[PDB]
Amino acid sequence: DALSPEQLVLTLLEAEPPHVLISRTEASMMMSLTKLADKELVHMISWAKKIPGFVELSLFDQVRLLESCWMEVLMMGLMWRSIDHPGKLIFAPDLVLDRDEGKCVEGILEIFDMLLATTSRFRELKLQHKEYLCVKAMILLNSLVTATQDADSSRKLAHLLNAVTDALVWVIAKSGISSQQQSMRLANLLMLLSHVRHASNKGMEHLLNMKCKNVVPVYDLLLEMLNAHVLR
């Protein structure tokens, strides 16, 4: 009964890690970002772990879920920090970027555009903090081929996702607005998610031709952290 709305929303509230800090030239940027990314991915795993039922899922599912959503989760987190600061992407209190500034990294601009844009749409939608938290967990749990041995784990996963989805519904209900407005809102929140998903996809295929030269691929960084903090 811990996967009840009120409980869950509170759990996510407390499970939220504190923003990482980082003092602030093509490569030099990738440096600071990669450095932050690594620092956030660690927190992400703790965050995941603190979600009701996650560590009870099969180890396979844990790795698969985290491997498949880190980009999107990082993106969602970026936008929320930079939701109230138009034209800017607040990677960290110190490190902040301007639209034009994005022209620095090879075509990272498209990602920047898509992001800055969607951030705006969320701002307009006046995204609430609790709405944000539920939506985030959804991404972790939602983002094909199922092995017989994984059957039970799958079954559970379905529940966690349903619960979090219900919690979001609940959070929207307490917003006070009319019933049909709740419907409309939920639909909207999900529409925008599809964008973030599309953006994070671009970002991946982007790294599928990344200048691995003066930086370390975040991939390798994650695969290592997983062996460290999820297997071991």
Ligand X SMILES: CC[C@@H]1Cc2cc(O)ccc2C2=C1c1ccc(O)cc1C[C@H]2CC
Binding site for ligand X (CB under 6 A): 30, 33-34, 36-37, 40, 74-75, 77-78, 91, 108, 111, 115, 203, 206-207, 210, 218
Residue 33 or 138: the one with the smaller Cβ distance to ligand X is 33
Q: How far is the CB of 115 from ligand X (least distance, A)?
A: 6
Q: How far is the CB of 153 from ligand X (least distance, A)?
A: 28
d(CA 203, CA 135): 20
Q: How far is the CB of 171 from ligand X (least distance, A)?
A: 24
89: helix, strand or coil: strand
Query: Counting Cβ atoms within 10 Å, is residue 100 exposed (0-12), middle (13-18) or buried (19+)?
Result: exposed
User: DSSP alpha helices (H): ranges in the chain?
Assistant: 5-15, 26-49, 59-67, 70-81, 108-124, 129-142, 151-173, 179-207, 218-226
Residue 169 or 221: the one with the smaller Cβ distance to ligand X is 221
Residue 9 or 114: the one with the smaller Cβ distance to ligand X is 114
Residue 164 or 218: the one with the smaller Cβ distance to ligand X is 218
Q: How far is the CB of 232 from ligand X (least distance, A)?
A: 25
Residue 11 or 119: the one with the smaller Cβ distance to ligand X is 119
Q: How far is the CB of 95 from ligand X (least distance, A)?
A: 9
Q: Please tell me the number of Cα atoms within 13 Å of 41 on its side-chain side.
A: 26
Residue 86 or 146: the one with the smaller Cβ distance to ligand X is 86
Angle made by CA atoms 205, 31, 62, in degrees to the nearest 5 = 55
Q: How far is CA 15 from CA 5, 61, 88, in A?
A: 15, 20, 26
d(CA 217, CA 197): 21
> Which residue in the shown chain puts its C-beta closest to ligand X?
33
Angle made by CA atoms 42, 48, 141, in degrees to the nearest 5 = 130
Q: How far is the CB of 65 from ligand X (least distance, A)?
A: 18
